[PDB]
């Protein structure tokens, strides 16, 4: 790999605002909220899923199952949602989820995600985690 | 046509979190890293690469331009700056990140890392008007 030459010297939705929004909504009862707020929460989950490394999605899936009491047979559909939100372009998969899932299924999934996302590490790589150790 | 998987079937009824990453960046943005040890500088390069990936691909242009403005760099310097951000954002197994460490001089790495840490926490991590308008009602 060849690096480029070094430089020659002659409401903002920031990472923190995203976390704060998730913390607030993880604490709320969204079972009765309006469709417009629920649609926005789906976007929040899609954006936040993309703040997890691709390799961390397996643990995210498994933590989701454990919190919800879901069986191991339910792992692939849950992992598929996370993987396809993570690789989503122009909200294509996110819109398919909104259109094809029942409201109750989306509320269950969004609540489970919001209540696990802030406690899980956003990186799974042993090299990244060991690399960052000296800085924390 | 995009087909979503079936919904889950209910039969009955220091960790590197995103907040830790932000707190680590906040702390190191305030430090003078001109004299720190190589092991801490190497770790800061990993912190920059990991954070870069917390920005959407489309937000990289604004990140590069904010970097150029803070540093007083000319517009002819935007492509190699954006190249760094684009290749850290798509990096696999730290391949591009290691090439930087190996090929750039210590001064260049210090300058780049300081500039990034001092701009990363103030920039939105999303550029899409659809995403930003979608999230508006929730903030």
Numbering used by the authors:
A (entry chain B): 114 to 123, 140 to 265
B (entry chain A): 113 to 125, 140 to 265
Article passage:
Filoviruses are unusual among mononegaviruses in that they encode an additional nucleocapsid component, VP30. The C-terminal domain of VP30 (CTD, amino acids 139–288) forms a conserved dimer of two globular, α-helical domains assembled by the extension of one α-helix from each protomer across the dimer interface to contact the adjacent protomer. Here, we have determined crystal structures and the biological functions of the protein complex formed by the filovirus transcriptional activator, VP30, and the core component of the nucleocapsid machinery, NP.
To overcome the low-affinity of the interaction, we expressed the EBOV NP peptide (600–627) as a fusion to the N terminus of EBOV VP30 CTD, and the MARV NP peptide (552–579) as a fusion to the N terminus of MARV VP30 CTD (146–281). The EBOV NP-VP30 fusion protein diffracted to 2.20 Å with ten protomers in the asymmetric unit, while the MARV NP-VP30 construct diffracted to 3.25 Å with eight protomers in the asymmetric unit. All of the EBOV NP peptides bind to VP30 in an identical fashion. Amino acids from the EBOV NP peptide contacting VP30 are primarily those that are highly conserved across ebolaviruses. NP contacts VP30 on the EBOV VP30 globular C-terminal domain, distal to the VP30 dimer interface. Very few NP side chains make hydrogen bonds to VP30. However, NP R612 participates in a salt bridge to VP30 D202 and NP Y611 forms a hydrogen bond to VP30 E197. The buried non-polar surface area calculated from the ITC experiments is 520 Å2, which is similar to the 620 Å2 of total buried surface area observed in the EBOV NP-VP30 crystal structure.
